[PDB]
């Protein structure tokens, strides 16, 4: 079926992967939740 992705890869249209993977992005959110739950707003202003 060739899907559409490498149908588009032919004729020279390519998608560059994002610099940050999905896992690390989720890791960033997890850290934000931990700071909010355990430290409230303090971690944003300075030391948690």
């Amino acid at each position: 079926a060739r899907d559409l992705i490498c149908a588009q890869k032919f004729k020279g249209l390519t998608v560059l992967p994002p610099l940050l993977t999905d896992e690390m992005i989720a890791q960033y959110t997890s850290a934000l939740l931990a700071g909010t739950i355990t430290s409230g707003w303090t971690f944003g202003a300075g030391p948690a």
């Binding site: 890869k9 390519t14 560059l16 992967p17």
Partner: protein
């Protein structure tokens, strides 16, 4: 990928969207741009 001309002349070359194994310069467009068959260890990234 270059550290900077002032810092050094060594360079790193990334071939986008290809396996290292099937299509290296070891076996090609830009032939003078060879960087040898194995200039260093080849690393297959996403």
């Amino acid at each position: 990928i270059t550290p900077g001309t002032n810092t050094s002349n060594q360079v790193a070359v990334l071939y986008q969207g290809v396996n290292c194994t099937e299509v290296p310069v070891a076996i090609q467009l830009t032939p003078t741009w060879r960087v040898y068959s194995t200039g260093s260890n080849v690393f297959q990234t996403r």
